[PDB]
Amino acid sequence: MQEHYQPAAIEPAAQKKWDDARISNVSEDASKPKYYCLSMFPYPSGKLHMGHVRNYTIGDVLSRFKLLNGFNVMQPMGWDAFGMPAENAAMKNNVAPAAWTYDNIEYMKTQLKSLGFAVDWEREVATCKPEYYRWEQWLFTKLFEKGIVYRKNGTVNWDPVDQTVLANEQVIDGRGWRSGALIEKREIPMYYFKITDYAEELLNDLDKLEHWPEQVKTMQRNWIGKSRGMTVRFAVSDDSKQGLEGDYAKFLQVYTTRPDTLMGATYVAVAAEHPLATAAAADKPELQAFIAECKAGADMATMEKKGVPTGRYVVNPLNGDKLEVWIANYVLWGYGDGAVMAVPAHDERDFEFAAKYNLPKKQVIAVGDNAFDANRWQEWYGDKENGVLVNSGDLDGLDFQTAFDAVAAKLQSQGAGEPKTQYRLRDWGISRQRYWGCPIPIVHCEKCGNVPVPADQLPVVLPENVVPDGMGSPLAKMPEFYETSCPCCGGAAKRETDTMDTFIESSWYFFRYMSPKFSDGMVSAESAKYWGAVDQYIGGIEHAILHLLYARFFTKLMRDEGLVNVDEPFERLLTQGMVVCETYYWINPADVELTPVVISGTEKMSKSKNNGVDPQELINAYGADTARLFMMFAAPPEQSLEWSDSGVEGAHRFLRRLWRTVYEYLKQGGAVKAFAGNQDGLSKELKDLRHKLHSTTAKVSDDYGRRQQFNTAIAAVMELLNQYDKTDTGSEQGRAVAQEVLEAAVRLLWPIVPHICETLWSELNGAKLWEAGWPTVDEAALVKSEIGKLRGKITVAADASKADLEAAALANEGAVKFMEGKIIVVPGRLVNIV
Ligand SMILES: CC(C)C[C@H](N)C(=O)NS(=O)(=O)OC[C@H]1O[C@@H](n2ccc(=O)n(C)c2=O)[C@H](O)[C@@H]1O
Ligand SMILES: [Mg+2]
Ligand SMILES: [Zn+2]
């Protein structure tokens, strides 16, 4: 054994050893219990930085923990390769996005392989390859035929200068980002997944996810946004029918989730495009301009709420009050009825609207004896659970649910309204007017219409010999791509030139890893049956809503097609915290050392301030194990992690110390058979070290397996080494216990720092580390030894309580013979019955 720790020497040798034994290349091995650990696969956008490395280290720690415990572990890796990053670089560097993407993949694969992650590279996928994306084209065509995917006009942000469609993120103050030209809203045909048909399933199945963080489930429930409420109709007054046709001449219909407060409605509000808004605005120039301002305008709660009165009235069907209709900019045409009622005394938005315009407020709910103040909003005004109806005539005294049913009763009997369930969830628009994405497998025929490509003609292949220029999608300018023949009639036709939302690839990639070479389907039945669901998913909170909901949606779509048999894709979910670092100017922290540049503020590792720390720089300086160790030790995985030059150094020193501990141990006599069995006759000090050892094994196992807090696992091993360092292990029985401690220490740490622990393990023991397996707890090592006047002595467990001593004291042969018909308890010394 070499004396000094040389990571640049041992790490490639250890990685070579693991690849040769194919430890991480796995099959559907029925002889071993499966474990599917998955980290969110990256966009191949450049270099990974320490932030990404934290994510993949965590996955590797859990994977290797399960490996050592005998599982058949699949830890797959892959490339989320479509999307905007490459198209910017395609414009930026005058390079094909494909060429730039594949180049990126190679740099990052070697980056990852150098960190020593236990990854099945034979299951690697790149989502920009036709062998991948053909299967999401296939699913598209199957769902299109069933109407689960449909085509429909939607409105988009058109920039007339750049001549491209803009995302709302790129629409600042009404104008485009790279142009500052006023955005034109355009109606164009687009494709949608009917995700609203699955809203109830997506919502209720969250309850199954007992090993998901509660806030993730809460964000999903709120995004879906189910409500059980009331459709309510307000008769238009005789004086207000002016201009209205059809059912709009008869009644104004709203949706409300507080029908229990209908007796406190003091005005109503309609969207700019509502027919009432149009009829009122006919001879009223002020309303015309307000309608116009609304049409041009996420930012809902942020925007100043505005309205104008219309002079039109509707009648409350419960109390007969004539209420004025307002046009308001917060009422959106396309959600529910495009009109709402307003209850300023019990809804905070209505309260502010009403306090702005001096509109009436009517208290119709009281909460205990809390007093009502029409000039100050108070949280209890909105109380749905502890309030009870006041000023509501007949309804006076009911609670929310009974008044709901009473109002539903009354309304239905008048024909004036019915209960209704609504969802905030919109359908999922997947059309993108971008080149670097999966082609939509539709052909447009002037005779047959929009027709799906037949399955045997899939994939529709995206040409990779393209350099976009940002002045439109190149596919719409590429005759050799879009000219084709109709699959239904043989006539001349045109391919769809929009590509798919690149969330589509990340919505099923975890199934493709089960059989990434399968050519007869998205995923083979044999492999989906074996791998089941992802046991453990690790990724950033930024994907807690859309990506996770889409992946759950796709799972249920695929189950309903018969391709998988689970309802939910991810059993456990771990949300690793951000990684932050000081900034400098914008100079990368590897171009800087400190005691001329400006040492600015600490913030998330990103390209914005060029403060991403390149893991390759960190490997070249200290080795992979030091990088892994620093990030697993610096903070619990969920907490944010501050980059620290001294933290990295102190991780490295720990690895030197661990190296030197095994070396000095082996210099003083070479390896011995590790202590095992009965420890009676061991000295107190070696008993205490064995106690620390097996306590440490139980804690690390709990920290890896239950708590997933790796930083405290490492601290516990350092404690063991500390007690080892103060224990005389020179004797024969001492060396056997030292061997036991070191064989367990290097195994306990192997998931965190596998290169050094693989190397040290082999100097200690000739067996293969993964066959020796995860260290076991020796419970016998966890048992400590047993411990008026005076008349009796008793033997007590070392963990005996003060009532166990008083128990055995009161029942002693010398006590009872001196009792003749207070009990001061000194633990470990004496007990006296006075
Ligand atoms: C499933 C699909 C939609 C994932 C998508 N390709 C993505 O976000 N791709 S990605 O390439 O952006 O990120 C890959 C993973 O790395 C994590 N990450 C990234 C930067 C960072 O600072 N920190 C601290 C950090 O943890 C990030 O949360 C994610 O799970
Ligand atoms: Mg369960
Ligand atoms: Zn045709």
Short mmCIF file of N, CA and C in Angstrom, two decimals, residues 505-585:
data_model
loop_
_atom_site.label_atom_id
_atom_site.label_comp_id
_atom_site.label_asym_id
_atom_site.label_seq_id
_atom_site.Cartn_x
_atom_site.Cartn_y
_atom_site.Cartn_z
N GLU A 505 -40.90 14.92 -23.84
CA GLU A 505 -39.84 13.90 -23.72
C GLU A 505 -39.57 13.54 -22.27
N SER A 506 -39.58 14.53 -21.38
CA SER A 506 -39.37 14.27 -19.96
C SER A 506 -40.61 13.69 -19.27
N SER A 507 -41.72 13.51 -19.98
CA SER A 507 -42.89 12.94 -19.34
C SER A 507 -42.93 11.42 -19.40
N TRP A 508 -42.00 10.78 -20.10
CA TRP A 508 -42.00 9.33 -20.17
C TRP A 508 -40.61 8.71 -20.22
N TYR A 509 -39.55 9.52 -20.11
CA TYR A 509 -38.21 8.98 -20.29
C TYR A 509 -37.90 7.89 -19.26
N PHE A 510 -38.50 7.98 -18.07
CA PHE A 510 -38.22 7.02 -17.01
C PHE A 510 -38.76 5.63 -17.37
N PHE A 511 -39.77 5.55 -18.24
CA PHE A 511 -40.19 4.24 -18.75
C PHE A 511 -39.26 3.75 -19.84
N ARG A 512 -38.79 4.66 -20.71
CA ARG A 512 -37.90 4.24 -21.80
C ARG A 512 -36.62 3.61 -21.27
N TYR A 513 -36.12 4.09 -20.11
CA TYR A 513 -34.91 3.49 -19.53
C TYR A 513 -35.10 2.01 -19.24
N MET A 514 -36.35 1.55 -19.10
CA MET A 514 -36.57 0.14 -18.81
C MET A 514 -36.26 -0.75 -20.01
N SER A 515 -36.37 -0.20 -21.23
CA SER A 515 -36.02 -0.93 -22.45
C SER A 515 -35.69 0.08 -23.53
N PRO A 516 -34.55 0.76 -23.45
CA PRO A 516 -34.24 1.83 -24.40
C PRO A 516 -33.85 1.34 -25.79
N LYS A 517 -33.77 0.04 -26.02
CA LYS A 517 -33.53 -0.51 -27.34
C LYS A 517 -34.78 -1.14 -27.94
N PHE A 518 -35.90 -1.10 -27.23
CA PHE A 518 -37.11 -1.76 -27.70
C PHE A 518 -37.69 -1.02 -28.91
N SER A 519 -37.89 -1.76 -30.00
CA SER A 519 -38.33 -1.21 -31.28
C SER A 519 -39.79 -1.51 -31.60
N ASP A 520 -40.53 -2.15 -30.70
CA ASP A 520 -41.93 -2.47 -30.95
C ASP A 520 -42.87 -1.69 -30.04
N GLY A 521 -42.38 -0.68 -29.34
CA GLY A 521 -43.23 0.05 -28.42
C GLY A 521 -42.43 1.03 -27.60
N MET A 522 -43.16 1.86 -26.85
CA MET A 522 -42.53 2.79 -25.93
C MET A 522 -41.66 2.06 -24.92
N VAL A 523 -42.17 0.95 -24.40
CA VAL A 523 -41.47 0.19 -23.38
C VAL A 523 -41.97 -1.25 -23.44
N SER A 524 -41.05 -2.20 -23.34
CA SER A 524 -41.44 -3.61 -23.44
C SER A 524 -42.23 -4.03 -22.21
N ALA A 525 -43.21 -4.91 -22.44
CA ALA A 525 -44.01 -5.43 -21.34
C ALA A 525 -43.13 -6.11 -20.30
N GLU A 526 -42.15 -6.89 -20.75
CA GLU A 526 -41.33 -7.65 -19.80
C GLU A 526 -40.57 -6.70 -18.88
N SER A 527 -40.09 -5.58 -19.41
CA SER A 527 -39.29 -4.68 -18.60
C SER A 527 -40.16 -3.80 -17.71
N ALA A 528 -41.30 -3.32 -18.22
CA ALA A 528 -42.22 -2.54 -17.40
C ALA A 528 -42.76 -3.38 -16.25
N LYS A 529 -43.03 -4.67 -16.50
CA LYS A 529 -43.50 -5.51 -15.41
C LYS A 529 -42.43 -5.66 -14.34
N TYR A 530 -41.16 -5.78 -14.75
CA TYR A 530 -40.08 -6.00 -13.80
C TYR A 530 -39.76 -4.73 -13.01
N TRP A 531 -39.54 -3.61 -13.70
CA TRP A 531 -39.09 -2.41 -12.99
C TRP A 531 -40.23 -1.67 -12.28
N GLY A 532 -41.47 -1.83 -12.73
CA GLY A 532 -42.59 -1.23 -12.01
C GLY A 532 -42.51 0.28 -12.05
N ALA A 533 -42.41 0.91 -10.88
CA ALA A 533 -42.30 2.35 -10.81
C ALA A 533 -40.90 2.74 -10.35
N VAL A 534 -40.58 4.03 -10.51
CA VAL A 534 -39.35 4.59 -9.95
C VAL A 534 -39.46 4.56 -8.42
N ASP A 535 -38.52 3.85 -7.76
CA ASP A 535 -38.53 3.82 -6.30
C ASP A 535 -38.15 5.17 -5.69
N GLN A 536 -37.29 5.92 -6.35
CA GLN A 536 -36.71 7.15 -5.81
C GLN A 536 -36.36 8.07 -6.96
N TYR A 537 -36.89 9.28 -6.90
CA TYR A 537 -36.68 10.34 -7.87
C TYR A 537 -36.02 11.50 -7.14
N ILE A 538 -35.02 12.11 -7.77
CA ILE A 538 -34.27 13.21 -7.15
C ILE A 538 -34.19 14.35 -8.15
N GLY A 539 -34.68 15.53 -7.76
CA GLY A 539 -34.62 16.66 -8.67
C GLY A 539 -35.06 17.96 -8.02
N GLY A 540 -34.88 19.04 -8.78
CA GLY A 540 -35.15 20.38 -8.25
C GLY A 540 -36.62 20.72 -8.16
N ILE A 541 -36.94 21.51 -7.13
CA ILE A 541 -38.30 21.98 -6.82
C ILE A 541 -38.90 22.75 -7.99
N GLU A 542 -38.07 23.33 -8.85
CA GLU A 542 -38.59 24.06 -10.00
C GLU A 542 -39.44 23.17 -10.92
N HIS A 543 -39.33 21.85 -10.79
CA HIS A 543 -40.14 20.94 -11.60
C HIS A 543 -41.29 20.32 -10.83
N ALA A 544 -41.62 20.86 -9.65
CA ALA A 544 -42.60 20.20 -8.79
C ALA A 544 -44.02 20.28 -9.35
N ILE A 545 -44.29 21.19 -10.27
CA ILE A 545 -45.65 21.35 -10.78
C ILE A 545 -45.78 20.74 -12.18
N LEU A 546 -45.21 21.40 -13.20
CA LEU A 546 -45.47 21.01 -14.58
C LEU A 546 -44.84 19.66 -14.90
N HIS A 547 -43.51 19.53 -14.79
CA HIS A 547 -42.88 18.26 -15.14
C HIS A 547 -43.52 17.09 -14.39
N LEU A 548 -43.66 17.22 -13.07
CA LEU A 548 -44.21 16.11 -12.30
C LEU A 548 -45.67 15.81 -12.70
N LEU A 549 -46.48 16.85 -12.92
CA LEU A 549 -47.87 16.61 -13.33
C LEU A 549 -47.95 15.96 -14.71
N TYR A 550 -47.14 16.44 -15.66
CA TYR A 550 -47.08 15.84 -17.00
C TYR A 550 -46.62 14.39 -16.94
N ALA A 551 -45.58 14.10 -16.16
CA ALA A 551 -45.12 12.72 -16.03
C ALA A 551 -46.19 11.83 -15.42
N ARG A 552 -46.92 12.34 -14.42
CA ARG A 552 -48.01 11.58 -13.84
C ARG A 552 -49.14 11.39 -14.85
N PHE A 553 -49.43 12.42 -15.63
CA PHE A 553 -50.44 12.32 -16.68
C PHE A 553 -50.05 11.26 -17.70
N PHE A 554 -48.82 11.34 -18.20
CA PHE A 554 -48.34 10.38 -19.19
C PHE A 554 -48.36 8.95 -18.67
N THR A 555 -48.03 8.76 -17.39
CA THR A 555 -48.11 7.42 -16.81
C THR A 555 -49.52 6.87 -16.92
N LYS A 556 -50.51 7.69 -16.59
CA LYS A 556 -51.89 7.22 -16.64
C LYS A 556 -52.35 7.01 -18.07
N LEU A 557 -51.90 7.85 -19.00
CA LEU A 557 -52.17 7.59 -20.41
C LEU A 557 -51.57 6.28 -20.85
N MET A 558 -50.34 6.01 -20.44
CA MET A 558 -49.67 4.81 -20.90
C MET A 558 -50.26 3.57 -20.24
N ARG A 559 -50.70 3.69 -18.98
CA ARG A 559 -51.40 2.59 -18.31
C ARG A 559 -52.69 2.27 -19.05
N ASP A 560 -53.41 3.30 -19.47
CA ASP A 560 -54.69 3.12 -20.14
C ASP A 560 -54.52 2.61 -21.56
N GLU A 561 -53.32 2.75 -22.14
CA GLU A 561 -52.99 2.09 -23.40
C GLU A 561 -52.50 0.67 -23.20
N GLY A 562 -52.26 0.25 -21.96
CA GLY A 562 -51.78 -1.09 -21.70
C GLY A 562 -50.28 -1.26 -21.77
N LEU A 563 -49.51 -0.18 -21.70
CA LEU A 563 -48.06 -0.27 -21.80
C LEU A 563 -47.38 -0.45 -20.45
N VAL A 564 -48.01 -0.01 -19.36
CA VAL A 564 -47.49 -0.14 -18.00
C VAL A 564 -48.67 -0.47 -17.09
N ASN A 565 -48.37 -0.92 -15.88
CA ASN A 565 -49.39 -1.40 -14.95
C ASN A 565 -49.41 -0.63 -13.64
N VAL A 566 -48.66 0.44 -13.53
CA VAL A 566 -48.68 1.28 -12.35
C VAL A 566 -49.57 2.48 -12.63
N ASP A 567 -50.02 3.13 -11.55
CA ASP A 567 -50.78 4.38 -11.65
C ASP A 567 -49.90 5.61 -11.46
N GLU A 568 -48.78 5.47 -10.75
CA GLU A 568 -47.95 6.60 -10.41
C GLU A 568 -46.49 6.33 -10.75
N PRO A 569 -45.79 7.29 -11.36
CA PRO A 569 -44.42 7.02 -11.82
C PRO A 569 -43.37 6.99 -10.73
N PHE A 570 -43.47 7.82 -9.69
CA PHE A 570 -42.40 8.04 -8.72
C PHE A 570 -42.89 7.77 -7.30
N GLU A 571 -42.28 6.79 -6.63
CA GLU A 571 -42.72 6.45 -5.27
C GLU A 571 -42.22 7.46 -4.25
N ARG A 572 -40.93 7.71 -4.22
CA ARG A 572 -40.33 8.66 -3.30
C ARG A 572 -39.77 9.83 -4.10
N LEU A 573 -39.78 11.00 -3.49
CA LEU A 573 -39.31 12.20 -4.16
C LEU A 573 -38.42 12.98 -3.21
N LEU A 574 -37.21 13.31 -3.65
CA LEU A 574 -36.27 14.10 -2.86
C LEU A 574 -35.93 15.36 -3.65
N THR A 575 -36.08 16.51 -3.00
CA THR A 575 -35.88 17.82 -3.60
C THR A 575 -34.59 18.39 -3.04
N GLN A 576 -33.49 18.25 -3.78
CA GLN A 576 -32.21 18.75 -3.30
C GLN A 576 -32.20 20.28 -3.32
N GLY A 577 -31.52 20.87 -2.34
CA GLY A 577 -31.44 22.32 -2.25
C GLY A 577 -30.51 22.92 -3.29
N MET A 578 -30.63 24.24 -3.44
CA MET A 578 -29.78 24.98 -4.34
C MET A 578 -28.34 25.02 -3.83
N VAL A 579 -27.42 25.31 -4.75
CA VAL A 579 -26.02 25.54 -4.44
C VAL A 579 -25.69 26.98 -4.81
N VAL A 580 -25.12 27.72 -3.86
CA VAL A 580 -24.82 29.13 -4.06
C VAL A 580 -23.32 29.37 -3.91
N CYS A 581 -22.87 30.50 -4.45
CA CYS A 581 -21.46 30.83 -4.47
C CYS A 581 -21.34 32.33 -4.61
N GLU A 582 -20.26 32.87 -4.04
CA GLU A 582 -19.91 34.27 -4.24
C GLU A 582 -19.74 34.56 -5.72
N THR A 583 -19.99 35.81 -6.09
CA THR A 583 -19.78 36.29 -7.45
C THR A 583 -18.66 37.32 -7.45
N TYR A 584 -18.15 37.61 -8.65
CA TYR A 584 -16.97 38.46 -8.80
C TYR A 584 -17.03 39.14 -10.16
N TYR A 585 -16.60 40.40 -10.21
CA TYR A 585 -16.46 41.08 -11.51
C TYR A 585 -15.36 42.16 -11.51
#
